Design an enzyme around this catalytic site. Structure first.
Site, PDB file in Angstrom:
ATOM      1  N   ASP A 126     -77.918  59.490  -8.824  1.00 15.02           N
ATOM      2  CA  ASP A 126     -77.667  58.507  -7.782  1.00 15.02           C
ATOM      3  C   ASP A 126     -77.182  59.215  -6.520  1.00 15.02           C
ATOM      4  OD1 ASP A 126     -77.598  55.998  -6.613  1.00 15.02           O
ATOM      5  OD2 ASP A 126     -75.626  55.453  -7.488  1.00 15.02           O
ATOM      6  N   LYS A 145     -82.219  61.157  -2.678  1.00 15.68           N
ATOM      7  CA  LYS A 145     -83.404  60.924  -3.497  1.00 15.68           C
ATOM      8  C   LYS A 145     -84.320  62.139  -3.561  1.00 15.68           C
ATOM      9  CE  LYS A 145     -81.131  57.344  -3.723  1.00 15.68           C
ATOM     10  NZ  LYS A 145     -80.041  57.390  -4.790  1.00 15.68           N
ATOM     11  N   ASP A 147     -81.046  55.717 -10.490  1.00 14.23           N
ATOM     12  CA  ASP A 147     -80.947  54.570  -9.600  1.00 14.23           C
ATOM     13  C   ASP A 147     -81.981  54.685  -8.473  1.00 14.23           C
ATOM     14  OD1 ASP A 147     -79.991  52.153  -8.472  1.00 14.23           O
ATOM     15  OD2 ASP A 147     -78.388  53.170  -7.371  1.00 14.23           O
ATOM     16  N   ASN A 148     -82.288  53.544  -7.849  1.00 16.07           N
ATOM     17  CA  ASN A 148     -83.018  53.520  -6.581  1.00 16.07           C
ATOM     18  C   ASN A 148     -84.429  54.073  -6.728  1.00 16.07           C
ATOM     19  OD1 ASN A 148     -79.914  54.574  -5.340  1.00 16.07           O
ATOM     20  ND2 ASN A 148     -80.729  52.491  -4.992  1.00 16.07           N
ATOM     21  N   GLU A 152     -78.089  46.718  -4.691  1.00 17.91           N
ATOM     22  CA  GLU A 152     -76.704  46.251  -4.673  1.00 17.91           C
ATOM     23  C   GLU A 152     -76.461  45.273  -3.527  1.00 17.91           C
ATOM     24  OE1 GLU A 152     -77.703  49.454  -4.803  1.00 17.91           O
ATOM     25  OE2 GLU A 152     -76.515  50.776  -3.518  1.00 17.91           O
TER      26      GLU A 152
HETATM   27  N1  LIG Z   1     -76.696  67.342  -3.766  1.00 19.77           N
HETATM   28  C1  LIG Z   1     -75.612  66.486  -3.936  1.00 19.77           C
HETATM   29  N2  LIG Z   1     -74.597  66.860  -4.756  1.00 19.77           N
HETATM   30  C2  LIG Z   1     -73.543  66.026  -4.918  1.00 19.77           C
HETATM   31  N3  LIG Z   1     -73.346  64.821  -4.351  1.00 19.77           N
HETATM   32  C3  LIG Z   1     -74.371  64.499  -3.554  1.00 19.77           C
HETATM   33  C4  LIG Z   1     -75.513  65.248  -3.301  1.00 19.77           C
HETATM   34  N4  LIG Z   1     -76.335  64.573  -2.433  1.00 19.77           N
HETATM   35  C5  LIG Z   1     -75.715  63.441  -2.158  1.00 19.77           C
HETATM   36  N5  LIG Z   1     -74.512  63.362  -2.812  1.00 19.77           N
HETATM   37  C6  LIG Z   1     -73.629  62.218  -2.754  1.00 19.77           C
HETATM   38  O1  LIG Z   1     -74.366  61.182  -3.416  1.00 19.77           O
HETATM   39  C7  LIG Z   1     -73.690  59.952  -3.100  1.00 19.77           C
HETATM   40  C8  LIG Z   1     -74.727  58.866  -3.093  1.00 19.77           C
HETATM   41  S1  LIG Z   1     -73.910  57.264  -3.239  1.00 19.77           S
HETATM   42  C9  LIG Z   1     -73.423  57.271  -4.991  1.00 19.77           C
HETATM   43  C10 LIG Z   1     -72.847  55.920  -5.396  1.00 19.77           C
HETATM   44  C11 LIG Z   1     -72.266  55.916  -6.812  1.00 19.77           C
HETATM   45  N6  LIG Z   1     -73.189  56.527  -7.806  1.00 19.77           N
HETATM   46  C12 LIG Z   1     -71.996  54.470  -7.171  1.00 19.77           C
HETATM   47  O2  LIG Z   1     -72.962  53.914  -7.758  1.00 19.77           O
HETATM   48  O3  LIG Z   1     -70.853  54.028  -6.870  1.00 19.77           O
HETATM   49  C13 LIG Z   1     -73.057  60.167  -1.717  1.00 19.77           C
HETATM   50  O4  LIG Z   1     -71.646  60.071  -1.875  1.00 19.77           O
HETATM   51  C14 LIG Z   1     -73.436  61.611  -1.379  1.00 19.77           C
HETATM   52  O5  LIG Z   1     -72.378  62.327  -0.748  1.00 19.77           O
HETATM   53  C1  LIG Z   2     -74.504  56.397   4.174  1.00 26.65           C
HETATM   54  C2  LIG Z   2     -75.763  56.048   3.444  1.00 26.65           C
HETATM   55  C3  LIG Z   2     -76.155  54.713   3.306  1.00 26.65           C
HETATM   56  C4  LIG Z   2     -77.334  54.390   2.629  1.00 26.65           C
HETATM   57  C5  LIG Z   2     -78.091  55.439   2.096  1.00 26.65           C
HETATM   58  S1  LIG Z   2     -79.579  55.036   1.231  1.00 26.65           S
HETATM   59  O1  LIG Z   2     -80.287  56.280   1.002  1.00 26.65           O
HETATM   60  O2  LIG Z   2     -80.121  53.907   1.973  1.00 26.65           O
HETATM   61  C6  LIG Z   2     -79.054  54.427  -0.367  1.00 26.65           C
HETATM   62  C7  LIG Z   2     -79.209  53.068  -0.614  1.00 26.65           C
HETATM   63  C8  LIG Z   2     -78.813  52.571  -1.849  1.00 26.65           C
HETATM   64  F1  LIG Z   2     -78.961  51.266  -2.076  1.00 26.65           F
HETATM   65  C9  LIG Z   2     -78.272  53.406  -2.835  1.00 26.65           C
HETATM   66  O3  LIG Z   2     -77.883  52.875  -4.057  1.00 26.65           O
HETATM   67  C10 LIG Z   2     -78.110  54.773  -2.608  1.00 26.65           C
HETATM   68  N1  LIG Z   2     -77.585  55.554  -3.576  1.00 26.65           N
HETATM   69  C11 LIG Z   2     -77.437  56.875  -3.316  1.00 26.65           C
HETATM   70  C12 LIG Z   2     -77.797  57.465  -2.119  1.00 26.65           C
HETATM   71  C13 LIG Z   2     -78.341  56.662  -1.121  1.00 26.65           C
HETATM   72  C14 LIG Z   2     -78.508  55.288  -1.346  1.00 26.65           C
HETATM   73  C15 LIG Z   2     -77.724  56.781   2.215  1.00 26.65           C
HETATM   74  C16 LIG Z   2     -76.547  57.071   2.901  1.00 26.65           C
HETATM   75 MG   LIG Z   3     -77.720  54.270  -5.605  1.00 22.77          MG
END
Ligand SMILES: Nc1ncnc2c1ncn2[C@@H]1O[C@H](CSCC[C@H](N)C(=O)O)[C@@H](O)[C@H]1O
Ligand SMILES: Cc1ccc(S(=O)(=O)c2cc(F)c(O)c3ncccc23)cc1
Ligand SMILES: [Mg+2]
Length: 212
Positions: free
Chosen positions: A139, A142, A167-168, A197
């Protein structure tokens, strides 16, 4: 003042301490009523819960913690002595996640790994005494789902039956990862259709079980 601090504050002001369910419902309420945020959410979270209960993983790896919502979601369902490790490269976010875990009473089960997955994954065996992973929650960004999956396999962290849960896979989408696991005979895939979400946009989770 960031959106992530405002979320943590709303939890501290409204959730019951040491109660992971109420922490979850508090995050979902704030993000439904005030500010959208990229937590996995309750609709996809319920599918996550069902997958976790089915497989009862002893060791879970999470890629991307953000504010800790999904780590709180999974850790509150782990058996006694089960562990969750979560990788987060943004230090502001990782500090919010630690505080969220502390408030929910889950600090003992979750270890935050500060850094980028691609750097931290090759150090899992040495620095955290990991043989293989039972489950992986992907997550983060992507474009890293497929590279980090290949890296996990390269580092010997996958075994027969390791559950990858992504996810996603529809929105914003992970097309190369999704094409890769569905076409590879090393993975048995199932799609769980849901919603983004706090929205009614279709999204889904992919379960990809490594076959060895
Ligand atoms: N290569 C990487 N290694 C570690 N964290 C990373 C990453 N690329 C993105 N992230 C982190 O991935 C997160 C995506 S949002 C994750 C939401 C969490 N899984 C939930 O469901 O509550 C962001 O905080 C971003 O900083
Ligand atoms: C600050 C910020 C906002 C939105 C996005 S994103 O790529 O739009 C996104 C949408 C989403 F629904 C998810 O669950 C995500 N999970 C993990 C990483 C991205 C996600 C990236 C960065
Ligand atoms: Mg996500």
């Amino acid at each position: 003042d960031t959106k992530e601090q405002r979320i943590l504050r709303y939890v501290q002001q409204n959730a019951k301490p040491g109660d992971p369910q109420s922490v979850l419902e508090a995050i979902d309420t704030y993000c439904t009523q005030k500010e959208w945020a990229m937590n996995v959410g309750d609709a996809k979270g319920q599918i996550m819960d069902a997958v976790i209960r089915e497989y009862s993983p002893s060791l879970v790896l999470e890629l991307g913690a953000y504010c800790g919502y999904s780590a709180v979601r999974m850790a509150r369902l782990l058996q006694p002595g089960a562990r969750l490790l979560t990788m987060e490269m943004n230090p502001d976010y990782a500090a919010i996640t630690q505080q969220m875990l502390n408030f929910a009473g889950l600090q003992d089960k979750v270890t935050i790994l500060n850094g980028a997955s691609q750097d931290l994954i090759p150090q899992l065996k040495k620095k955290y005494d990991v043989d293989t992973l039972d489950m992986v929650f992907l997550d983060h960004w992507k474009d890293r789902y497929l590279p980090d999956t290949l890296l996990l396999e390269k580092c010997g962290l996958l075994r027969k039956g390791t559950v990858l849960l992504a996810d996603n896979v529809i929105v914003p989408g992970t097309p190369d990862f999704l094409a890769y696991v569905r076409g590879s005979s090393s993975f048995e895939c199932t799609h769980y259709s849901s919603y983004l979400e706090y929205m009614k946009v279709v999204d889904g989770l992919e379960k990809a079980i490594y076959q060895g």
